[PDB]
Amino acid sequence: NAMRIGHGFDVHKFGENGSGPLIIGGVRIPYEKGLLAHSDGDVALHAATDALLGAAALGDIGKLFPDTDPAFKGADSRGLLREAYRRILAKGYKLGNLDITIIAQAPKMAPHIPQMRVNLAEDLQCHMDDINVKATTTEQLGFTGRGEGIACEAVVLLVNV
Amino acid sequence: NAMRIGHGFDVHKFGENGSGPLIIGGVRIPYEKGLLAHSDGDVALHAATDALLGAAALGDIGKLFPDTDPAFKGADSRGLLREAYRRILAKGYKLGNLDITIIAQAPKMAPHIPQMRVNLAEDLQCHMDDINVKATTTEQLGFTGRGEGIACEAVVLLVNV
Amino acid sequence: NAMRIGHGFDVHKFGENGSGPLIIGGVRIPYEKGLLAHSDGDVALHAATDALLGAAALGDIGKLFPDTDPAFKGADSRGLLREAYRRILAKGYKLGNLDITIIAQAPKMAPHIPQMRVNLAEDLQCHMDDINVKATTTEQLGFTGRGEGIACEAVVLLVNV
């Protein structure tokens, strides 16, 4: 039972032309709209969490932190990540590595990726070499391209201890 | 050559407002429309199969079970899964673990996941701990959100014997 | 640090009704439009590259080959792949296996997959058994289904040397 694979996927619709400014990978990114979600609305962490729990066959964030429950209204996605990893460790697994892809027309994710990596390496208690983050656009096609929300895909490897 | 990775992806358009009621992960889920496909139309099994065959570098379900061939009109996706695994075993591989994500606005996948896991653990001849299933919506965005079909992504790890 | 996982994702919008004819997985496929990209516009290689670099926590193709830089206007995606792998080897990793899924309504990818596999096995310097390629459509749904562009997802396993 040496190694386990996991996959995550999250999308959030953009809000009004208010503020937010969208938080992603625990980083506050200036933008003229934020994302609409029951929680912090951080698609990168949501997708990373789902990957982790999925690898551990623990379901997903829903299965750990009921979406219905008012205790998680606006809750910090970094907190959820951190709890999820505590459970994974409990079960005798440890992060191998993590690869994330943000899918967004705008804003540019590039400048914020180093800090995102810092946050995750901190949260999954590991060296920053086990964390990789990418962005791409869909060349203006589909709802991400039409500019309506952003999406995120994650892929994870867990190692036995 | 210790371990091999695989990825799958399937989508089916919804039919009329007839019946179906859609079958997914081998589970019959009540819903006012079913999916339109040449076979059973089970996106979770289709995507899981593709992942498995992909990891084994065996192509995909097309390469094993010609879509053109009338012998697979309405064929049980569980049967196809089962044959595909027989071939994978033949080649000296065995499931490590499987993680699936269903992408759908409605109906709720939650209540049916335990049974889906039972079906796969049965079919891939393994303990149910090596099988993980998740759902998410795309927050009403895109064709899954517009309610037009459902999509499924799968990720697999094969181990050498 | 035995094995590392990676994920890639690319999409390109179709051009006019001119020529192109679209190049994918290094194969020239007859079609009445080609893809619109700053480079060769080969979504299969782009996604494969991103997976590789992602597994190596090296960022993505952007981080190696600035999109802004005029030296990569129309550049061969096979060249980029090849350079990326040189860097991965430099860091003590080697391909385990690769699985790719092309997502397209038309044209049919089927007949070209053997040759695509030849190109990659050549480029990643390995036996063709470590390379798997698939296509699917989205049953005419979404922008791939509406026929507006094609998309590609890749998944990779790197082994330590």
Curated annotation (Swiss-Prot), chains A, B, C:
Signal peptide: none annotated. 4-CDP-2-C-methyl-D-erythritol 2-phosphate binds at residues 10-12, 38-39, 60-62, 65-69, 104-110, 136-139, 143, 146. The keyword Mitochondrion does not apply. Gene3D superfamilies: 2-C-methyl-D-erythritol 2,4-cyclodiphosphate synthase. CDD domains: MECDP_synthase (cd00554). Its cofactor is a divalent metal cation. GO terms for molecular function: 2-C-methyl-D-erythritol 2,4-cyclodiphosphate synthase activity; metal ion binding. A divalent metal cation binds at D10, H12, H46. It comes from the Bacteria. It catalyses: 4-CDP-2-C-methyl-D-erythritol 2-phosphate = 2-C-methyl-D-erythritol 2,4-cyclic diphosphate + CMP. The record marks H38, T137 as: Transition state stabilizer. Pathway: Isoprenoid biosynthesis; isopentenyl diphosphate biosynthesis via DXP pathway; isopentenyl diphosphate from 1-deoxy-D-xylulose 5-phosphate: step 4/6. InterPro entries: MECDP_synthase, MECDP_synthase_CS, MECDP_synthase_sf. One of its GO terms (biological process) is isopentenyl diphosphate biosynthetic process, methylerythritol 4-phosphate pathway. The keyword Ligase does not apply. Its EC number is 4.6.1.12. Keywords: Isoprene biosynthesis, Lyase, Metal-binding. Involved in the biosynthesis of isopentenyl diphosphate (IPP) and dimethylallyl diphosphate (DMAPP), two major building blocks of isoprenoid compounds. Catalyzes the conversion of 4-diphosphocytidyl-2-C-methyl-D-erythritol 2-phosphate (CDP-ME2P) to 2-C-methyl-D-erythritol 2,4-cyclodiphosphate (ME-CPP) with a corresponding release of cytidine 5-monophosphate (CMP). Homotrimer. HAMAP family: IspF. Belongs to the IspF family. This is 2-C-methyl-D-erythritol 2,4-cyclodiphosphate synthase. The gene is ispF.
